[PDB]
Ligand binder design. Sequence first.
Ligand SMILES: [Mg+2]
Lengths: 1327, 542, 49, 79
Amino acid sequence: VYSYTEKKRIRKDFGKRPQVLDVPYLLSIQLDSFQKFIEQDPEGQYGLEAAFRSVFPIQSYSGNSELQYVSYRLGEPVFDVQECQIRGVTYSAPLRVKLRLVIYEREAPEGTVKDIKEQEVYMGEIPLMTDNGTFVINGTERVIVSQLHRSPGVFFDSDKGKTHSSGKVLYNARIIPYRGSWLDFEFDPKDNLFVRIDRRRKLPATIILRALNYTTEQILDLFFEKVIFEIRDNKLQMELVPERLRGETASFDIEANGKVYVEKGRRITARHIRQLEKDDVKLIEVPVEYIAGKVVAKDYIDESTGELICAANMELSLDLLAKLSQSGHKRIETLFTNDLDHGPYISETLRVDPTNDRLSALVEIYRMMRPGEPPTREAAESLFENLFFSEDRYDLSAVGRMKFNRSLLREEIEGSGILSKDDIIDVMKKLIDIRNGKGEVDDIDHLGNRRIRSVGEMAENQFRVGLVRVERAVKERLSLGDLDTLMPQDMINAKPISAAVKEFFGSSQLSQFMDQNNPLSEITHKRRISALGPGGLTRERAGFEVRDVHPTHYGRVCPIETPEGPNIGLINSLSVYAQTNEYGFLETPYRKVTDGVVTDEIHYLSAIEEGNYVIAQANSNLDEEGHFVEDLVTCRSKGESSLFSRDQVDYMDVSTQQVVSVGASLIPFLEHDDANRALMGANMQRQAVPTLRADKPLVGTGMERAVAVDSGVTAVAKRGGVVQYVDASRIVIKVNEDEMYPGEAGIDIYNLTKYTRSNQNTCINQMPCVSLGEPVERGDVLADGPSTDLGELALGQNMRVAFMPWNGYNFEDSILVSERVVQEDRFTTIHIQELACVSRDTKLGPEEITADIPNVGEAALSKLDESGIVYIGAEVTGGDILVGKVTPKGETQLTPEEKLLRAIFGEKASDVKDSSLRVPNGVSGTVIDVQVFTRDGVEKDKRALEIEEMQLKQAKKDLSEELQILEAGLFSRIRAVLVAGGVEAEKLDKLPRDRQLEQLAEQYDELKHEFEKKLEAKRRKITQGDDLAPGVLKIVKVYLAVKRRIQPGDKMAGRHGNKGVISKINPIEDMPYDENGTPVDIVLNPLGVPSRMNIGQILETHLGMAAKGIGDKINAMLKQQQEVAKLREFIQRAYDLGADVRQKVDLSTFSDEEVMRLAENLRKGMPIATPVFDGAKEAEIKELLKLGDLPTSGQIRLYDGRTGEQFERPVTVGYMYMLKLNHLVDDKMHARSTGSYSLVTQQPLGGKAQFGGQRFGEMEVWALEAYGAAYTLQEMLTVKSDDVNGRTKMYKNIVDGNHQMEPGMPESFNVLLKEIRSLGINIELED
Amino acid sequence: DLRPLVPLDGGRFATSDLNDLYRRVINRNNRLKRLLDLAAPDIIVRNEKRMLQEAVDALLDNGRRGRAITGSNKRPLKSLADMIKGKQGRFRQNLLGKRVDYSGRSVITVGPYLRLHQCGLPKKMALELFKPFIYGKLELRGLATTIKAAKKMVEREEAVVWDILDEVIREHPVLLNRAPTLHRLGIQAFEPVLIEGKAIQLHPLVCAAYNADFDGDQMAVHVPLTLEAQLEARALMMSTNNILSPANGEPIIVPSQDVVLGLYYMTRDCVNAKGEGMVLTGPKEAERLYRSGLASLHARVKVRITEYEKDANGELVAKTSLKDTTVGRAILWMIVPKGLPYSIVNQALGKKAISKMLNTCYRILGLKPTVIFADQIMYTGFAYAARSGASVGIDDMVIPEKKHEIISEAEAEVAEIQEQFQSGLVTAGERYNKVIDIWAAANDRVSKAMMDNLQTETVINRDGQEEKQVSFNSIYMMADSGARGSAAQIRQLAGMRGLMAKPDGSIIETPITANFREGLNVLQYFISTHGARKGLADTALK
Amino acid sequence: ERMGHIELASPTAHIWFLKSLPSRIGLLLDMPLRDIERVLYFESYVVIE
Amino acid sequence: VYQGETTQTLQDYLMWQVELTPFSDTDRAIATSIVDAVDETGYLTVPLEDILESIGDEEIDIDEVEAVLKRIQRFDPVG
DNA sequence: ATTGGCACGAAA
DNA sequence: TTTCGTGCCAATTT
Ligand SMILES: [Mg+2]
C-alpha cells in the first residue's frame, strides 16, 4: 500500500532488515521545548508559571501590602508569519497577566483585609515559534541552537600529578548549582583538606564546619570511630577488635589468656586475625609507650580542679597520662587513624585551623569574601546565610538535586533547592573515602554528566532575569504610602522584561540567522548542538578531551558530522532517533530481548542506564521467530565491545542508521568510505545551491522523503479531497464531506511562494506537482519547494562520469566539464539581491521621492515611472537610477548670479540636490519586485496604491470563492424548497436567481453581511500604515534577480568528500565517447580515489550506471508503443531483483493508467535506495547490470574525441550525483589599482564591498626579506599603502613612462609618534 | 584628525572612546578647579582628586588598575595603550604589515599548457591592475590627447585598449602569493598570459612549493612598479630561479601524479606484446610504428641509439650502438638532452627515477636545459597518461582467497586463550598481550597474502608457455609508480584494517577484520571515528 | 599634527611608572607598592618631613 | 575602532587632473591658485587680479593666467 | 591553561 | 638573621 505521491515514482529499496520503529519528526526538539515554555501547566514548573511563582508574591518591608499573581494569557498576533516577513516586523503575541494588590491593616492580628484590587496588565510581546521551529524577529527567520552544558550537582575529579613535581594525585570535589555559588573541596600534598568558595583564596575545611555550628568533639565523632580506653588499674588494658589491626606491624607485646598470639616485632597476619576472631580476644594489655601518639577524642576535666586538663584532638603524652590517671579517671576516648585505610586528615586540618569557635569562622569567611573593610557579626551572618541557604540567591534545581542524591547514593530523588549540613558532611565523607581508596572519580565527558538546554529553558531564564528586576522596582516604589488610590497597572513597567526578551531573541550568541541554502541546511541547523555560548566553553580553552568521541555518544551524537577547524568537537549534531529526558539528558531507543527472542517493545535508555546492560549490535542476523543464530554475539556492555553468549543479551539496536545524523544518513555506501572523507562530504552536502530544475539523486538511501516533508519547504495537504483548481501560484482543494466541519464551505487554499529571496541571496520558489481533478489525501505533497522533486530531496544533478586522466586538466582535484552541461543549464542558479532607499525629514524641508532630477538627462529617467521608481521587469546595470530622490538645500538670500540662474533655467533646478538610489558597480539583474513603506499620516504615491490594489485582489478572490460556494449551496436549498410547491419546471429556469423561505432569505442576507465584514477587515488590515523610525518618511525596496551559469573556477562536489574546481569547459566533439557515440559529461581523476579511500563513489557510479540502463530499457520500450503487459512484466522483474529484500512491489494491484504513469516517471532511470549500513551488495549490482544488458565489471571502451583512436584500457563509466557549492568565482575575483583610504592610517581599505586592496602581512615581508628584494619591499611599504605624496608622484611618473619612485615616510609612523607623545613620553627623530 | 567622530545616518555623531575619556578628564578637572576656587571642605576635594586620578588612569591605560570603565553595551573603552600595543595595535597591524594598491586575488585553476615561467591572468583583472600604464600608453601614441580621454576610453573598453594591454604586459613580471606564506617560496614571479574567464591558471610543477591544490584555493597577485622591482622579480623571485630548496638543497620541481603515472606506463615492458622482436633504426621509427598501430608501447625490441658523453676538455663525443629496449623508452629518449646516457631511461621510471634524471640533468648540463627538460617531461607525462586510459574499478581491489582461513585460525587461537583464562592459568595482562600479538600476526599474514596476490600476473609466452610478470593492475600501478597511495592504504582497501586505539591510547583487542571493498558494520565504523577525529583535532589545533 | 594640553588642577601619577611590575616609583622611593597606592588614592597619610 | 574613508571632492578631481597635465612649475602654481578659488558649483569666486597677486611673482602677466585658466576650463566637467 | 617574576611566610 | 618555598599577578596563545 503506497500513497498517491509515492505511487507515482516508487524507489527500489535494497534494504533487507525489517523496520520496527519509524523515523520520528525531525523538529521535535524545538517544538516540544517551546511548548513547555508557552503552554499552561497546572503544576508550578515548566514555563512562565515557574518564573511567576519564583518571584511572586512581592511584599514590601512594612508588610502592609503585597502583589499576588493569578494567571497569564497570550493574545492573538496582529500579523501572520507571511505578513510579518513582508512588512519586516516581529511575529509575537502580547502577554496579559492578572495581578492583584491587597491592603493589610494595623494594630490587628495578622493582616486584616482592608481592600483587594485585581487588574490585568500588559507585560510586553513574546516572540512565537512557527510551525517549522523558527522565529521571525525582523522580517527574517532565526534559529536558537540548543546548548550542551555541564549538569548541576556534585562531581569528584583530580589532577593527574601535573600540579606537583612528585606526581601525587590531589583529589577534589565541586558542587555546582543551577543558580548560585559553587563550593569546592580539595586536598594538598601534605594531605590536609581545604575548602574554597566561589573560586577564591583557599581556606581550611574546618572553617565551614565550625560555621555550621559544630564543636570539635562533634566533628571528631562524625569523622572518626571512637576507641575506648579502660583503665583496669594496670597499664591501660585495651578492648581489642581484630579487624583494626589488618595490615599493621605490632610495636609492642600482644598477649591474651596466657597465649602470645603476636610477639614484639612481628606483624599481624590474616591468620592471626582469624584466630583472634575465633577466640573473641577482647582484653589486651598495652605499655605506656603505645600511647605516645594516640589522640584523645573528647575533653576530660579533673573533678578536683575543675579546669581543662587537655583540649580535644591532641595527642596524649606520658605526663598527661599520669595526670589523668592520678585524677581518678577510668574511661578515655581516642580516634582510630591507621595510615593505610583510615587516613588522619580531619585531625591535621583541625590542627592547621586557627579558629576554635563559631563566630571567628564567620568573621574569617566575611573577610575572605570582602577584603578591605572592618568585619561585622550581623553582616557576616547575613553573608553566610545568603551564600548557600537562601532560596532567593541559591537554587539546586530538580535535575541538580537528582544528580546530587544519585552521586551520594541516596534513595529520595526530590528535595529542597538549597544546601544543608548533611549534604556537606556527606560530600566531605565521600571525598575522604575516595582519598582512602574506596571510590572512583567522575568523567566530565560522559553524556550522563552533560545536559541539553533548549530555547524554552533559556527564554524562561531570561524572563526570570527581567522579572527579578521588575520585582526590585516594585519593592523600591512600594515604600511610599498611597495604597488608597494606586492600581497595579501603574505599579509596574513592562520595559525591562520586553527589553530582556528582545535582547535574548535578537542578539544572543545562540540565536542565529537560519542557514537557508537548502532544506538539509535548515534541518541540520535546527538539530544543532553547541558547547559554546553563555555558560559553556570557549574554543581557545577547550582542550583535546572535550573534543573527542565518547562511547556514550553512541546513538545520541553523530560521530562523523562536525566542522573541521577551531570548532571541531564543539559543534555536534543530533542522531536520528535521539531524544531528551524530562531532565534534559539524551536517550536512545532499544528493543528488549526477553527469553532469548527480540520483542517489539521499545525502551528509551539514557547514558547512565545504558552501561548496566548488554546490548546487541544492529547488524546481527535473526530468524523468522526472532532468535540469534551466532552463539558469540558482538555487544557493548560497559563502554567496551566484546563477544557474549545468546542468553546474556538484554537489548538490541532498533535500526542500522541510529548511530548517524540526518546529513550522514543521506550518503549512499557510507560504510565503504573513510571517516574523514565522510565528514567532509557531510559538511559539503548542506552548502549546495538549488538549480533551475530539480533532479532526484537516482541513487539514494531512503531518507530523502523524510527530509523533504519534515522541512517546511513543500506544500502538504492538510485534509484530503480533490484538486478543484490548480495554478502556478495557487492550489484550491475541495475537501471531502467526511472531513468537513459543520456549517462550513470545505475548501483549502494554498498560496505558493514565488521567487523570493532567502538569507543567502538565493531563490525560493514553489512548483505545483498535482493535476486538475486528481484525488489527494492528508499528508500528500501538493507543491515542491527548492531542491525538491516529487516530494524527495534533490540537491544536485545526475552526471555521466568517466574516471581517467585527460591531458592534465583534472590534475589535483581539477574537473573537466563538457559544453553540453553548460548548454542544458543543468547548474544554472538564480540569485536575488535587495536594495533600499530611505527618504527622511531634514531641517530644510523633507526629502522627496520624485521624477524631477534637474541635472540628469532625459534618457537616464526613461526606466522610472511617474512616481520616480523603476518599472517592474526593467533590465538594469551599474550606475542606473532605481529610485529618484532629491535633498533640499536652503538659503533665503538670492545673489544676482543666483537670480540670473533661476531666471534662465527655472527655480526648480536651484535649492535642490540629488540623492537618488543607484545600482552599485558590477551589479546587474532584472527588477522583479518593488515594495513601498510609508509612515502613517503621510500621503501615498501612485505606486503604493497599485500595490495595495494588487494585495486586495487576492483576498477578494479567496473570499469570493468561499462565498460563491456557500451561495451555490444556499440556492440549491432554495430550489429544493421552492420546487416542493408550485413545481415550476421552466419558470425558475427562465427567471433569474433572485426568487420558511423568508428564513432562507434572511440567512442569505446574513451571509452577505458577514462576508462584507470579512472583506472590510481585510481591507483595513491592508491599508494600515507603518511605524518606521524617528525622522524616517518613506522606504523603498527593490529586488534584482540574476542567473549565474557554470564556468571555470566554480566549486563542484559529490557526496563522498570528493570536491574540486572546474578547470575547462570542453567542446562536445573533444569528449571521450563509447561505441554508440555518446560522450561523457564530466571526467574525474582516478588518482584521487586510492589515497582518500572513499570507495563509495565507485559503487555509486556502478549502481547509477545500472539504474540508467534500466531506465534506458524502459524508455526504449516506451518509444515503440507496446502493450502494458510487457511493460509491467519488465517493471516487476526490475522490482523483484535482489537477495531477500524487505520491499514487495505488486503491480497486479496497479491499474493500466497507474502503470503507464509509473513507466513515464521511470523512463529516465529507476531510483534506488541503499541504507547507510543495510545497502546493496556487489552481487546485486552485477545482477542489476545484467538485467540492463551492461557489462558486469562496469567498464567499457572509450575513444578519443580529437583523434578517434581507442584508449588502451577499459574505463569506469557511469552516473554520479554532483552538487554545485556556494563558492562562485563571480564573488571571488577582485582587483584594484587605486581607490579610497582610511582617514587615520591613510592605508587602503579591505574587502570587496569597497574597492579594497590585499594585505601584505608579516609573513610576506619575511619572504621578501629572504629573497633580498629590498626595492620591492620598500615600494610595498611606502608608495603603495600610506605615503600620500609618494602615491601621487608614483602615479604621475607611471603615466609619464618613468618607472621611478621617491620613497618618503609612512604616515602610520607619524600616527604612532603622536600616540606615544600623547602618553607623556618624549620620542623624536634626530639628525 | 587621529580621533575622528562617527558620522552615521540621521545626523547622529555619537562619540569615540578617546573622546569620552577626554571629556571625563576635562569635567573632573573643571569641577576640581571650581571647588578649589570656592574653598570647599576637604572631605569633598579629596574625593574629587581621587576621581580625577582614576579618570586620568582610565585615559592612559584603562583596566590596568581597578575595574575598566565600560561604554553603552558594557564593553571596556579603548585607551591610548590599547591603540599602541597588541596584535590590533599600530606595530603589528599598520607598520609590520599593511594593505597595498595594485593587488588582486581570485581562485586558481590548472594550466597544463603553460611554461614554467608563465602564469595565466584574467584580462579583466589585468585591465584594472595596469590602468596607469594603459593611460600612459594611450597618451603616448596619440589615441588620447588628455588624461580624461584615456579614462573614458578605458571605461568604455574599446577594442584598441586590449592591444594596448597586450603590449604593456609583454615583459612585466607579476608576483603570485598564497597564504599562509610559510617560506619564501610562497611568493613567486611569473610572466602573465592574458586569458578569458575569472580564474588564475597555475603551472602544475610549482604547485608543490605553494602547497596548493585545485579544490577552492585562492591566490593574490601583485604588480611591481619600478625598474628595480621588476628586475628583482625577474632575477630573484622568478620561478625558473627557484629549483633548489634553501632549507636542505633538494629539488622543488619534482613531478607527481599524472606525469609520473604516464611516464611509468610508457616505460614498461610486456612479455608478449605486438611488434616484439623487431629491429628499429631509431626512436623516430619507434614513434612512427606506435602511431600507426603496428607495434605496442611495451614491446621489447632492439633500437639503434646514439648517445653523447662529455670529454675531458668538456666537449661532446657521440657513440652509436644497438640497445635492447622497448618502444616507449625509445620514444621518450627523443626528449632527453644530448648530455645524458641512455641507461637513465632504459628502465621503469617511478617518482624517484624521474627525480634522479632531473637531478642528473641539472648537475651535468645546467639550468636552462633542466627547465626545458622539466617542461617536456610534464608534457609527455600528461599526454601518455591521458592516452593510457588508466581507470579504477571495484574489481581492482582484489581480496586474497586465504583471508578467511587466516581470520578463522586467529579466532580459534583467541578462543583457546580465552578458555584458558577462564580456567585461570594466566592473568589478564598476559592474555591481553597474547591476543594483541595473535591479531598482529594475523594482520601481517593477511597483508603479505594480499600483496603477493596483487603484484604478479600470468601471461602467455611466444611459444605458448606460461610466464609470471609484474601486474598491470591500475591500483598496483598507481601504488608502485609512486604517483598516489602507499602500502598501508592498499592494505586498508583490500585487506583487514587491523587494530584500533581508544582516544586515551589503549589498543582495542578485537580488530576490524573488514576492508573498504567490503562494508564495515556500525561498531567498526564507530570505533574508527576515535582515531579519525583525534587526527583531525590535532591537525586543527597545531 | 597639532596637539593640545590640559592644565590639571592637582598632580596625577602616571600609571605606567606605577603599575608595571618593576615599579619605578616604588623602587626609586624604596617603598612597597601597596603603601604607594594607598597614599595615591587618598586612603592613608605619609610624612614628608 | 572607526576611522572613516577619504572622499573625492571637486577640487580633488581638479588637482588630480592638474597633476597629470604637462604644466610648467609657474603654470602649475597658477593652476593650484585657480583650483583653490573654485566653489562647490564650479565657478571662479575671485578675479584674476587676486590670483596674480597670490602668485607673488612680478614676472607673470595676466595673459599667462588667462591661458592657464582656459586650459583648466576644458577639464572634466567641461565649463 | 601555562609560564615566569615578585612578595610573603616558614625554616636553618 | 639569611634562605628556600608558596601564593599572587601579568604576560602569552595563526
Ligand atoms: Mg585546497
